[PDB]
Recover the amino acids of this structure.
RNA sequence: GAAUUUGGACAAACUUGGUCAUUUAGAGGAACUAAAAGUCGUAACAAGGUUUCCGUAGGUGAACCUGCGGAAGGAUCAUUA
RNA sequence: GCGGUAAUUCCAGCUCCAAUAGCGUAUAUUAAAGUUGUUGCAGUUAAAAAGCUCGUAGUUGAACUUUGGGCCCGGUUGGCCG
RNA sequence: GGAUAGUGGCCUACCAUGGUUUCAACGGGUAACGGGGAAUAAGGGUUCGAUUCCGGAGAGGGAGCCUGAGAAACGGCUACCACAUCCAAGGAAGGCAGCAGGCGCGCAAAUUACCCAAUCCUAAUUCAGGGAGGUAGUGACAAUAAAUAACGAUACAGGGCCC
């Protein structure tokens, strides 16, 4: 929390019979690092 | 109700102009902390990442490009901390150069900064074991605004064509840890140097959460006043940054401890600590009074079977009517049918090898026990429990046990951490006598004998940190724990491991568990840290109310840095409700097979032992349930029923559980 | 993860050819040396 | 021929109330949420209603009946001329 | 869409496919969209013919008034010859 | 009639009672400068056009004016409004939507570099001057071209071509 996050669009349609809703955004960046690169252990995260 | 809206050109333009005027005002207010004429203190720390590199030189460049030869010459003589006012941009910098022989001194230096400059070598590649760890650890504990700068670039070929190569490779190395930046600046050129100086002066430094929410003063002058023969008042002249200090709250000082305040004066009024004083005692005497209702004081000595009465059989009563038959020499059977009435390097090496072996053993075979024939299983597990579902049944936190630590009552039992944290931080913000940007004399009470270790504020950094409410009071804390990169080595859950959160460092024998959320808040006790995933480390240690990042390490004298960096993470929770059950698995081989009844072998060795564990469920790693029926032989063989059909390649197992208690922690110095 | 500073260029199983070459490879993986498996052209089979 | 002065057109801007429209910091109060927890009400209680609709009127009630006028969007056997 | 000891459908490796010094993702927009329809939609029952007629602007509006025949002039392609 | 370089309700007197409007006036909206043009479609269209040429408008917001053939000019002046600088507290200066550069803002955009050699402009003028313009730096905005391998022998391994 308190982390800067770059968001984009995301197309998950929500469903009715199970009360799943449709968020419309996916995190693309955290704290200036690409979510992907972190996940690839390619780049590391400056934690402040 | 209310009519609708039809915003005109004018309305729009205005709402805009107002939004932006407000934005601008707020920005000016937030950029007034560095009015470089009277009220500013931009802390820049110089961190070279290469052995064969001089920090004094890096400063020399930055201030020679300010065209001030005097301020350079006056610093060579004797100093390491400087108060440099630049007139070009009108700014008050404070430069700090660390003792590059002490790792922890580097961390302490940077962790107070508003800016971290990184020196990079054009000649020497950064060390994998030292400088790299500087990068990562700084990064984990917290960094404000950082910069990547070079000095050694002229040491390579004289033609720029080759220098720019080194520069760019350094840029791509530096980008890896610090993607916020893409330009490693070259001080050799006047332009880049003038530009980095420019930034340090002008650019506003970002915020590091935990340090900014409790306030901090970097000390310029430290004097001492004798009051009593055995203790006096440390006086500290320094500018306050962050949230500020209150006279009542305690102050931490690194490698010295937590102390309480006596007086504070401002020179930009006088405030003295009164009756609302935070006290210098860990286990508050009110904590003893908070845990008064001891709920379960169960006596495991008054048990004929395993404690599992909630889901098991019924209290079987065995009224023993023993009479003695007097035929000389006679079995217990005949007697049962005569009187029947009806109405230092070697040590470490050997031990460490054994720990690796036990850990890999713990991966291949999790929590299994090996019972011997001579071993009375009952006694050996008499204190244990035998719950069916570990996350459903009713463990409790308030249970009294001789194994429980004496202090357990005297602990700070915060109900809710998320809310208490916010409330107390708002209190501290509102009740702040001394705000950021104030110059302060700080009069702290202090035991005389420690004055010997205190150095000079100009050759060594002297930082003064603020504490919040009850932060001196111990509690049951849960940390998030993740292994450091390239660290395969084993780490058991009882060995001393130093932990740095905030600026405070406490040696800790932490209990490792998996933070998997449970409806009854009961988590498996993991003897050794999991090699892949984030885990949880629980122990009795002073509270932290800003969720500081934590660094886990074990001081190793041999390495350059006198520290082995084990793992990292965060201060998660001030919670006692977390209980930890040491599991204990009993293993047995399914001997013989009948179409519904399976005879099981080598899990006990007495029939009475089998009686004792009747109710306890049997699970097979093939993923199948079952229960015991009755004892076959006088050797502990036991018949059993199950869910599916099991072969001789399966393992029948029992799960028994015990309460595991957090352990007391002591501060760590030097 | 971390390639050290020595990215300074100036002063395992066999690799796959790049560019043109690779296409060539495919042209013979599919048309010069045809592999007819079970009455179909099978791409990426294990044991069959 | 400078300072200065009479009256004009041009006319920024100011003061004042009044008026809508917003930005705000505060206080008044009201209402909604649950990866919150348990408590009763009926959960952990049992069924009953089943031509279906339209406009309209009323009654209410926890729902649903009911008056008047419409519609089939409702299942034509049998005899005979 | 699809399951759980045995999973081609999830996770990791191996393999393979596509475009390749480039490739993915987000928003916008055009095509797809004959789902804006002048070209070119639909309107009994799928969304949709106003309860009904009158009526001004508007759009729209039957047929008919030198056809038919005779003469001459000179062009530009195409053939049979050159 | 006055004013203007000049027609003209442009303004001033005096007369009239007109002028626009369902063929959509008037008002409101535009995250609207207009065009040459751009993207995409078989066609017909739909959607872009702040931006290299043309035309217009502005130089923090308004208004006023000197000089001059030409300005209601802001790298001219004056005042008020908004900001903001130096002061020795009397005063004095200020407009980067020119080139670079900084802050802020944000999803979002480069060097405080070299030169009049081209292009052309200005001047009393062949010479002077020109961040107009040109040259390099940064930059995976785009667009073009196209390295990352070509052979051979050998053997093993097979198929096919004729004896
Ligand atoms: Mg349709
Ligand atoms: Mg219908
Ligand atoms: Mg219908
Ligand atoms: Mg009809
Ligand atoms: Mg006609
Ligand atoms: Mg506009
Ligand atoms: Mg089409
Ligand atoms: Mg345009
Ligand atoms: Mg615009
Ligand atoms: Mg133009
Ligand atoms: Mg103009
Ligand atoms: Mg401006
Ligand atoms: Mg002139
Ligand atoms: Mg002007
Ligand atoms: Mg200008
Ligand atoms: Mg101009
Ligand atoms: Mg500019
Ligand atoms: Mg010249
Ligand atoms: Mg230019
Ligand atoms: Mg490009």
């Amino acid at each position: 929390e308190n982390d800067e996050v770059l968001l984009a669009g995301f197309g998950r349609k929500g469903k009715a019979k199970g009360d799943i809703p449709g968020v419309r955004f996916k995190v693309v960046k955290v704290s200036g690092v690409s979510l992907l690169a972190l996940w690839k252990e390619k780049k590391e995260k400056p934690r402040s | 109700g209310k009519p609708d809206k039809q915003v005109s050109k004018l309305q729009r333009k205005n709402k805009a102009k107002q939004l932006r005027a407000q934005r601008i005002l707020d920005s000016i207010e937030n950029r007034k902390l560095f009015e470089g004429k009277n009220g500013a203190a931009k802390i820049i720390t110089i961190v070279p990442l290469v052995n064969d590199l001089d920090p004094l030189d890096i400063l020399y460049k930055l201030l020679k490009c300010a065209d001030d030869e005097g301020i350079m010459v006056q610093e060579v003589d004797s100093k390491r901390i400087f108060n440099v006012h630049i007139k070009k941009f009108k700014s008050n910098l404070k430069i700090i150069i660390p003792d590059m022989t002490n790792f922890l001194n580097i961390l302490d230096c940077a962790k107070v900064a508003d800016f971290v400059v990184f020196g990079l070598s054009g000649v020497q590649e950064v060390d994998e074991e030292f400088g790299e760890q500087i990068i990562r650890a700084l990064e984990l504990q917290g960094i404000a605004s950082y910069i990547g700068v070079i000095s050694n670039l002229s040491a390579v070929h004289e033609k720029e064509k080759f220098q720019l190569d080194v520069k760019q490779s350094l840029e791509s190395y530096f980008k890896h840890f610090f993607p916020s930046e893409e330009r490693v600046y070259n001080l050799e050129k006047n332009s880049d140097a003038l530009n980095v100086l420019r930034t340090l002066c002008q650019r506003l430094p970002r915020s590091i959460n935990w340090r900014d929410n409790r306030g901090y003063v970097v000390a310029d002058f430290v004097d001492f006043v004798e009051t009593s023969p055995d203790s006096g008042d440390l006086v500290i002249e320094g500018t306050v940054r962050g949230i500020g200090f209150n006279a009542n709250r305690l102050v931490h000082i690194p490698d010295f401890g937590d102390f309480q305040l006596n007086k504070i004066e401002k020179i930009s009024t006088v405030f003295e600590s009164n009756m609302n004083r935070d006290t210098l005692d860990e286990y508050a005497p009110e904590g003893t009074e908070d845990w008064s209702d001891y709920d379960e004081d169960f006596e495991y000595d008054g048990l004929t079977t395993a404690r599992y009465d909630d889901h098991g059989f019924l209290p079987g009563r065995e009224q023993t009517s023993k009479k003695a038959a007097v035929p000389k020499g006679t079995s217990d059977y005949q007697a049962k049918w005569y009187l029947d009435d009806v109405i230092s390097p070697e040590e470490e090496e050997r031990q460490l090898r054994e720990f690796r072996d036990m850990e890999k053993e713990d991966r291949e075979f999790p929590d299994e026990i090996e019972l011997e024939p001579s071993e009375s299983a009952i006694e050996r597990l008499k204190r244990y429990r035998g719950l069916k579902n570990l996350y459903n049944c009713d463990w409790q936190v308030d249970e009294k046990d001789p194994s429980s630590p004496a202090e357990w009552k005297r602990l700070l039992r915060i109900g809710n951490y998320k809310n208490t944290k916010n409330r107390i931080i708002k209190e501290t913000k509102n009740e702040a006598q001394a705000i950021a940007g104030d110059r302060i004399r700080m009069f702290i009470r202090f035991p005389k004998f420690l004055l010997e270790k205190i150095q000079d504020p100009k050759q060594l950094l002297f930082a003064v940190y603020g504490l919040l409410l009850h932060e001196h009071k111990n509690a049951v804390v849960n940390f998030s724990l993740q292994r450091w990169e390239q660290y395969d080595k084993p780490v058991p859950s009882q060995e001393p491991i130093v932990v740095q959160y905030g600026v405070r460092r406490y040696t800790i024998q932490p209990l490792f568990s998996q933070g998997s959320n449970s409806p009854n808040n009961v988590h498996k006790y993991e003897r050794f840290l999991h090699p892949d995933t984030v885990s949880v480390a629980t122990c009795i240690a002073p509270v932290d109310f800003t969720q500081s990042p934590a660094i886990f390490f074990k001081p190793s004298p041999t390495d350059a840095k006198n520290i082995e960096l084990i793992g990292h993470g965060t201060f998660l929770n001030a919670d006692h409700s977390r209980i930890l059950a040491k599991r204990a698995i009993l293993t047995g081989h399914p001997f013989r097979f009948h179409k519904t009844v399976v005879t099981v072998r080598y899990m006990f060795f007495r029939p009475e032992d089998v009686e004792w564990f009747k109710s306890i469920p049997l699970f097979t790693k093939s993923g199948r349930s079952g229960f015991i029926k009755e004892s076959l032989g006088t050797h502990g063989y036991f018949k059993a029923t199950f869910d599916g059909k099991l072969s001789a390649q399966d393992v029948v197992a029992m799960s028994l559980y015990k309460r595991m208690w957090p352990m007391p922690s002591l501060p760590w110095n030097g | 993860m971390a390639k050290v500073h020595g990215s300074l260029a100036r002063a395992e199983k066999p690799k796959k050819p790049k560019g043109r070459a690779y296409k060539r490879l495919l042209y013979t993986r599919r048309f010069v040396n045809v592999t007819l498996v079970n009455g179909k052209r099978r791409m990426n089979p294990g044991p069959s």
Notes: The longest strand of chain B covers residues 579-593. Chain B touches chain C at residues 121, 125-126, 128, 132, 157, 162, 165-166, 169-170, 172-173, 176, 485 (CB under 8 Å). Residues 7-8, 10-11, 14-15, 17-19, 21-22, 517 of chain B lie near RNA strand D (CB under 10 Å from a C1'). The CA atoms of residues 162 and 642 of chain B lie 75 Å apart.
